[PDB]
Coordinates of C-alpha atoms in Angstrom, one line a residue:
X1 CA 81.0 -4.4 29.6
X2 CA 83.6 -2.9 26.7
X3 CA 81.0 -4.7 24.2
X4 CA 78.4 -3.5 23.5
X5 CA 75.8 -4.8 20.1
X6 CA 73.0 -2.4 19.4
X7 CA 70.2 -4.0 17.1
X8 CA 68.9 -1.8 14.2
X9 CA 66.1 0.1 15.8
X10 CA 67.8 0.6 19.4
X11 CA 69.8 3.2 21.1
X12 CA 72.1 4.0 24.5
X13 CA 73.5 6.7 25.7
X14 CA 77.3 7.3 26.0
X15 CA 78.7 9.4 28.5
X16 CA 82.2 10.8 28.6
X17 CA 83.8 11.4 31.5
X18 CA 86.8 13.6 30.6
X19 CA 84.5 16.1 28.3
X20 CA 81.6 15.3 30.6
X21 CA 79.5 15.1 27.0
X22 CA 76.5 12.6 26.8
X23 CA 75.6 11.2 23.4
X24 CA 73.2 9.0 21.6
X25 CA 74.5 5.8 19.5
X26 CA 72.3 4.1 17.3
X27 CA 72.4 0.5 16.1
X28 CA 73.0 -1.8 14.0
X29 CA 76.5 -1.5 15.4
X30 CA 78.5 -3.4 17.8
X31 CA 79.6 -0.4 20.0
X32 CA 83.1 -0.7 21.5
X33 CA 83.6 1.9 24.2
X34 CA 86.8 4.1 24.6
X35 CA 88.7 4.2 27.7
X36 CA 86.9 7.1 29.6
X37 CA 83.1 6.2 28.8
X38 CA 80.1 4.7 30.9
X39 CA 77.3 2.9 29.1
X40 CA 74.4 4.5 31.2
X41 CA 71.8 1.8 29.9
X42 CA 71.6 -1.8 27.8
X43 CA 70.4 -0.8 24.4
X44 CA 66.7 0.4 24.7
X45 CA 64.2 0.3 21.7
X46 CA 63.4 3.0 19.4
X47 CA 60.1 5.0 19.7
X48 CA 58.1 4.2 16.8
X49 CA 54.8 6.5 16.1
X50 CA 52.2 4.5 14.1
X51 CA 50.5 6.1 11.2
X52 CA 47.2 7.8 13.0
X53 CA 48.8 8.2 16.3
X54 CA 50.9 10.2 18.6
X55 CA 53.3 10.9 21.3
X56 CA 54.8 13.6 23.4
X57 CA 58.4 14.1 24.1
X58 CA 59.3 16.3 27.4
X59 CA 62.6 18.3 27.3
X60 CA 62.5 17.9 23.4
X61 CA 65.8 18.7 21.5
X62 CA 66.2 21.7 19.8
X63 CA 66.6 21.7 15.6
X64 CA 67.6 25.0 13.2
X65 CA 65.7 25.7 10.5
X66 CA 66.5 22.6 8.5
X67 CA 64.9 20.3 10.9
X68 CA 68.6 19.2 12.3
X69 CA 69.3 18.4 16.0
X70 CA 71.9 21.4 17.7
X71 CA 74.8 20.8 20.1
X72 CA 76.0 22.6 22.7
X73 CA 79.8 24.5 22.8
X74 CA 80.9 21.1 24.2
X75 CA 78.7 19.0 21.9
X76 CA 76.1 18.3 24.6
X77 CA 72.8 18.0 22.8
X78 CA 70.4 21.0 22.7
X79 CA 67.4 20.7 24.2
X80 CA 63.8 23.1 25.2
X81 CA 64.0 22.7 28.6
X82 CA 60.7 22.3 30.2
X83 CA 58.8 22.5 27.0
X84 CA 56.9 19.7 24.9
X85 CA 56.5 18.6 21.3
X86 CA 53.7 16.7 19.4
X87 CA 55.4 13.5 17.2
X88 CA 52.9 11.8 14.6
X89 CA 54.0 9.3 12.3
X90 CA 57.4 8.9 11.3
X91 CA 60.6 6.6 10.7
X92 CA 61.8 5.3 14.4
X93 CA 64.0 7.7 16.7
X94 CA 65.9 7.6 19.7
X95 CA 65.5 9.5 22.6
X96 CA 68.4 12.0 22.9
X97 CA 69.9 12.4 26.0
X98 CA 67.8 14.5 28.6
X99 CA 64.5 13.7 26.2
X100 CA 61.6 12.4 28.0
X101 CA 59.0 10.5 26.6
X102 CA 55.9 12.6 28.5
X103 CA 53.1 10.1 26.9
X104 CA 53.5 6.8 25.1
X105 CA 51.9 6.2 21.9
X106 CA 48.4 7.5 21.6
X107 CA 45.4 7.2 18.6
X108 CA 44.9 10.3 17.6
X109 CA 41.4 11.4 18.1
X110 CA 38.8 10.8 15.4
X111 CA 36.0 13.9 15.8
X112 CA 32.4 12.3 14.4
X113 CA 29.6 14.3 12.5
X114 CA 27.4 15.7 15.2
X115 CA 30.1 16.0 18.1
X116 CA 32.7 18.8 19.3
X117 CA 35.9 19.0 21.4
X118 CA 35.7 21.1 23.6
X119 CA 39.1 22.6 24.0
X120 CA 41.0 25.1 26.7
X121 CA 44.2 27.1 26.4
X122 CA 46.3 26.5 29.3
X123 CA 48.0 29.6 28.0
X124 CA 48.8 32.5 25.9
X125 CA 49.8 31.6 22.4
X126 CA 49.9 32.1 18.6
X127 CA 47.5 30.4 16.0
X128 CA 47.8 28.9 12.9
X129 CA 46.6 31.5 11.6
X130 CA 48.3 34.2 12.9
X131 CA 46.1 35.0 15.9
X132 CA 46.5 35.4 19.7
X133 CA 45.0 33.1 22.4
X134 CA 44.4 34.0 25.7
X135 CA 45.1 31.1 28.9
X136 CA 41.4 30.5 30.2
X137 CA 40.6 30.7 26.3
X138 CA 37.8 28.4 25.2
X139 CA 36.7 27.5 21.7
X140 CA 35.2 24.0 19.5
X141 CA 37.3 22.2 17.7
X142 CA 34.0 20.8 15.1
X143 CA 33.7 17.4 13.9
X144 CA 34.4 15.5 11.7
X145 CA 37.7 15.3 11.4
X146 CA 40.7 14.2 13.1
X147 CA 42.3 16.8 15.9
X148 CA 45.8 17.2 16.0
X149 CA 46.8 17.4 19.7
X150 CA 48.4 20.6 20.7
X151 CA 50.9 21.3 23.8
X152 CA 49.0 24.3 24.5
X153 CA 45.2 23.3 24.9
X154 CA 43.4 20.9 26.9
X155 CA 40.3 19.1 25.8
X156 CA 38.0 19.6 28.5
X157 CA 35.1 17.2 27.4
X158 CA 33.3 15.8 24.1
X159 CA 29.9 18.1 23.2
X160 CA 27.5 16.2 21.7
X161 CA 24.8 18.0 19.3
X162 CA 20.9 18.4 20.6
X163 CA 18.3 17.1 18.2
X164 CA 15.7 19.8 17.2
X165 CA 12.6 17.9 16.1
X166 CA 9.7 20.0 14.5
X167 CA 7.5 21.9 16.4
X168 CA 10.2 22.1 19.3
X169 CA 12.9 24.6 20.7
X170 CA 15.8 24.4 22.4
X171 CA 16.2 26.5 25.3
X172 CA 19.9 27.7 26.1
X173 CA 21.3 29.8 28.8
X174 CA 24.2 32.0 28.6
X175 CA 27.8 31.0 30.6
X176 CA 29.3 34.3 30.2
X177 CA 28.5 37.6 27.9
X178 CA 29.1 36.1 24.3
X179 CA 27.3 36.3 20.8
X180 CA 25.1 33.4 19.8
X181 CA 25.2 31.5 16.0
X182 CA 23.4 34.5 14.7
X183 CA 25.5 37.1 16.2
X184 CA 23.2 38.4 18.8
X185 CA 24.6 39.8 22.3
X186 CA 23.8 37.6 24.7
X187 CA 24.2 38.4 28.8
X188 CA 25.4 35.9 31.2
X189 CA 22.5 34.1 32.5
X190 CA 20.3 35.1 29.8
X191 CA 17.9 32.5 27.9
X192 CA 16.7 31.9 24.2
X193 CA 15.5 29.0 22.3
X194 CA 17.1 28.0 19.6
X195 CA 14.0 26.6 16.7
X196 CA 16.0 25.4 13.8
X197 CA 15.8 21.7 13.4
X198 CA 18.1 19.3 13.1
X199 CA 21.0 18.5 15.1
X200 CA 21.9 21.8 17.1
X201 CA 25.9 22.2 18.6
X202 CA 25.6 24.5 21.1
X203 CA 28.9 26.8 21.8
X204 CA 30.9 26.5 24.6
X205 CA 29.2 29.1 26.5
X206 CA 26.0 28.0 25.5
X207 CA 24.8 26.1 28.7
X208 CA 22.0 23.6 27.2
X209 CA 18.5 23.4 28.6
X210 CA 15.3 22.0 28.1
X211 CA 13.3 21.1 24.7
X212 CA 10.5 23.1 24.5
X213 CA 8.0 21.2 23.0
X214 CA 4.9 23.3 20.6
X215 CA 1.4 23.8 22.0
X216 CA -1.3 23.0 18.7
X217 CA -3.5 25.6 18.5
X218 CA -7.3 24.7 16.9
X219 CA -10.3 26.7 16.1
X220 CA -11.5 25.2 19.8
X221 CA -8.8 26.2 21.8
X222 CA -6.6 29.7 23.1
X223 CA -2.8 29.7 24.8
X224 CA -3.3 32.4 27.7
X225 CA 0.0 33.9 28.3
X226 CA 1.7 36.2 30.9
X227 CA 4.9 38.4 29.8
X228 CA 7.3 37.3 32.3
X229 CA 9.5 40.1 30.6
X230 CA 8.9 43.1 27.8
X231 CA 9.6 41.4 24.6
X232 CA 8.6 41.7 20.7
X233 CA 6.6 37.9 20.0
X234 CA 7.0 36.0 16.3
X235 CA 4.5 38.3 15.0
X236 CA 6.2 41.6 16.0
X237 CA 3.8 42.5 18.5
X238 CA 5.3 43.8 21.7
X239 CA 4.2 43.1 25.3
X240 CA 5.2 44.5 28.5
X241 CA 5.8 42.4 32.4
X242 CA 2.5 40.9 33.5
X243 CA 0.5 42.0 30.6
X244 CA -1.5 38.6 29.6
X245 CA -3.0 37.9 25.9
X246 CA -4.1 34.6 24.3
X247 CA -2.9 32.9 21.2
X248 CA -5.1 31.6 18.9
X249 CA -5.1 29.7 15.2
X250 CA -5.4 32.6 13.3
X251 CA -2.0 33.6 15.3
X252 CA -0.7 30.1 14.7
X253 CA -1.0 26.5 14.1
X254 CA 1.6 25.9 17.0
X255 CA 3.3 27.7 19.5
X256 CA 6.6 27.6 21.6
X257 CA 6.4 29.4 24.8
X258 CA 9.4 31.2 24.4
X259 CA 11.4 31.9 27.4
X260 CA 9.7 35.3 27.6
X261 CA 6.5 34.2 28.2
X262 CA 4.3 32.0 30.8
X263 CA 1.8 29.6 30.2
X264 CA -1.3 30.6 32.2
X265 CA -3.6 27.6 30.2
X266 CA -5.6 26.4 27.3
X267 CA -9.0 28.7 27.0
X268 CA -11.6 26.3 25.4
X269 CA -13.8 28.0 22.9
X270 CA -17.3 29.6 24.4
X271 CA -20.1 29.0 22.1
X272 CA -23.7 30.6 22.4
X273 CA -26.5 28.7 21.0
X274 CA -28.9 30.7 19.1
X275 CA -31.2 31.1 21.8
X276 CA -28.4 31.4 24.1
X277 CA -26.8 34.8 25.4
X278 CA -24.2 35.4 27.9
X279 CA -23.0 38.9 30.5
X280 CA -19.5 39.4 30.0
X281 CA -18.1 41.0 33.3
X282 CA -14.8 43.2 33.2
X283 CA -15.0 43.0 29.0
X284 CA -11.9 44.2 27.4
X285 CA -11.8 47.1 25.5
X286 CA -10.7 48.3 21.9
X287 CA -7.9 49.7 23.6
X288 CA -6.8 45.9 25.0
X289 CA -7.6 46.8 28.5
X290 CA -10.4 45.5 30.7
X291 CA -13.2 47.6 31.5
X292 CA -14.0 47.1 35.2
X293 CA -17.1 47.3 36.8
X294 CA -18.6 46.9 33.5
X295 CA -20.8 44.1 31.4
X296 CA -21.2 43.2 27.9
X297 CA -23.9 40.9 26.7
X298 CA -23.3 38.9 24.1
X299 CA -25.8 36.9 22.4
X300 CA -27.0 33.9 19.8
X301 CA -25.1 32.3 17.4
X302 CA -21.5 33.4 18.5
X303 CA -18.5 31.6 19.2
X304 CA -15.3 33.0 21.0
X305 CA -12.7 33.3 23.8
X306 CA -13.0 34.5 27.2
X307 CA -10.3 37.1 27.4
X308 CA -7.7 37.8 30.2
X309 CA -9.9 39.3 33.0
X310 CA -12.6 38.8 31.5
X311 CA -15.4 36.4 33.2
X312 CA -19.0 35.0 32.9
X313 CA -21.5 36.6 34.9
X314 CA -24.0 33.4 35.3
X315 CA -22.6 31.1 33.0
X316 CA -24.4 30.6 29.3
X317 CA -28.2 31.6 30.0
X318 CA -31.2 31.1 27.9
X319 CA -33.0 33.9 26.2
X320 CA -36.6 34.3 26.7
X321 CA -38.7 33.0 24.9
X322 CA -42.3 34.5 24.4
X323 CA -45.4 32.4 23.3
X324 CA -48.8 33.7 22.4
X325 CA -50.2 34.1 25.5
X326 CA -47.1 36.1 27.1
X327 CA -45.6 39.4 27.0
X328 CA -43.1 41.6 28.6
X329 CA -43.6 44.9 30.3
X330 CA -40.4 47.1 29.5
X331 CA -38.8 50.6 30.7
X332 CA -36.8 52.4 28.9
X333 CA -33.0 54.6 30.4
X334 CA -32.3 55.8 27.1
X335 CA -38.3 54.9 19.7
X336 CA -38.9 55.8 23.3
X337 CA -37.5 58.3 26.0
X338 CA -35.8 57.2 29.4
X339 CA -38.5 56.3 31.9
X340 CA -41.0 55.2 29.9
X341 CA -42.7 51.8 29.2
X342 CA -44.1 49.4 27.1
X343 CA -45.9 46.4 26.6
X344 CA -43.9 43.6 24.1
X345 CA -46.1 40.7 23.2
X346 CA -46.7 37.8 20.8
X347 CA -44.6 35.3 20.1
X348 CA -41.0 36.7 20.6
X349 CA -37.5 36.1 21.6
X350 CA -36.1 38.7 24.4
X351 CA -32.3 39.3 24.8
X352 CA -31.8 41.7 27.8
X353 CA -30.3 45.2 26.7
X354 CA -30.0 46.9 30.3
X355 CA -30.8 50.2 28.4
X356 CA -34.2 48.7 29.2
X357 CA -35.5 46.6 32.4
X358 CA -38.1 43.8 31.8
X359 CA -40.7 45.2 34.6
X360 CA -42.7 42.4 34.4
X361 CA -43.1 38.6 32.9
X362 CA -46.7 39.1 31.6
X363 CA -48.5 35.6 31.1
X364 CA -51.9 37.5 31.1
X365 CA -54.6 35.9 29.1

């Protein structure tokens, strides 16, 4: 056809075949063409962006520094070869010739309160603000908010934040060497908990674990640990590998296992009855350490915790108990020298002392 009309928001392209020089012409018009010119297409629509949405144009044509399209020595358009450009909202365009439209319209994406993007550099560039970005770069773009897209970064995935309820921790692990929220080195493979509540985001090499959920200490009840490593606990006490201590209520109301340590059990309370006494065997020392070989007796209105190590020689056993008619012959291996003995009588209560032997269970009357 020599006719050609163009509607208002369409375009073709022109080409000339003695200067070789394709063009763009934009309706309304009824186009007439000149003797050495091919119409290379009926008149195609504009591309219209939508407010809140984009595109992405492939082989985009170049523009100085007044936004204006360039031509070539011949009047060819000017384009960036192989690159890309980002269009949001604006007034209809054409498509210049050589311009590709790489993706069709597109929402731009809405980023809600407690999520991320989690985006990727597919290669070196410069920032926004001036800085430099490396390819296999990863980072958070942080919601809320709306993310513009950008030809050089992929978004890899939506993160979602972890809820921290009280009396829980998160446990992370480390993708790579990086420095947690706080600013704290942290190793690949490593693991913390995180224990602020609320809604935790973790960063993109922040690999996300399990809760941790508290264990509630009472006046009944001891956490035995083991150190699965040497580490510095809430309280600032340090412990080393395989060392084991408990946690009580005076320690705290509840406790986290951190990743540090390993739950052995809950120690119930042992209580002693005021006629009641008990042998420790293997009792721990002043110096924290179990004394082996050893015994303690403990007696008669006491309450406490079995320590690491430590263990019961024949469970909780009754005192004895002395009428009238009964007494107690006792030696002495210590007031009295060592070797010596004694008669005890009356009505009495006896707690063994092994510094002294009862001999003999005198019911002699």
């Amino acid at each position: 056809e020599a006719i050609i009309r163009i509607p208002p928001y369409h375009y073709i392209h022109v080409l000339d075949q003695n200067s070789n020089v394709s063009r763009v012409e934009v309706g309304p018009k009824t186009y007439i063409r000149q003797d050495n010119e091919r119409v290379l297409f009926a008149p195609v629509r504009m591309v219209t962006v939508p407010p809140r949405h984009y595109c992405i144009v492939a082989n985009p044509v170049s523009r100085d520094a007044q936004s204006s399209v360039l031509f070539d020595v011949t009047g060819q358009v000017r384009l960036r070869h192989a690159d890309q450009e980002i269009r949001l909202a604006q007034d209809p365009f054409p498509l210049y010739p050589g311009e590709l439209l790489e993706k069709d319209i597109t929402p731009l994406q809405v980023v809600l309160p407690n999520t991320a993007l989690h985006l990727k550099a597919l290669l070196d560039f410069e920032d926004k603000n001036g800085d430099k970005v490396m390819a296999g770069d990863e980072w958070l773009f942080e919601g809320p908010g709306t993310y513009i897209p950008q030809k050089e970064v992929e978004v890899v995935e939506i993160i979602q934040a972890t809820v921290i309820k009280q009396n829980q921790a998160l446990r992370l692990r480390a993708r790579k060497e990086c420095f947690d929220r706080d600013g704290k080195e942290r190793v690949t493979g490593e693991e913390w908990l995180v224990r602020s509540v609320g809604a935790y985001l973790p960063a993109v090499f922040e690999e996300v674990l399990d809760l941790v959920d508290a264990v509630i200490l009472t006046e009944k009840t001891a956490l035995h640990l083991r150190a699965r490593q040497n580490f510095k606990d809430l309280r600032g006490v340090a412990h080393r590998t395989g060392e084991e201590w408990l946690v009580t209520v005076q320690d705290t109301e509840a406790h986290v296992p951190d990743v540090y340590e390993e739950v052995l059990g809950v120690v119930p309370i042992t209580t002693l009855g005021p006629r009641h006494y008990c042998v420790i065997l293997d009792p721990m020392g002043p110096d924290g350490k179990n004394q082996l070989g050893q015994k303690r007796v403990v007696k008669g209105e006491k309450s406490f915790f079995l320590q690491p190590g430590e263990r019961l020689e024949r469970g909780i056993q009754d005192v004895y108990v002395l009428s009238e008619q009964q007494g107690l012959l006792l030696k002495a291996l210590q007031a009295h020298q060592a070797g010596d003995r004694w008669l005890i009588r009356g009505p009495l209560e006896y707690v063994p002392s092994a510094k002294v032997e009862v001999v003999e269970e005198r019911q002699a009357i």
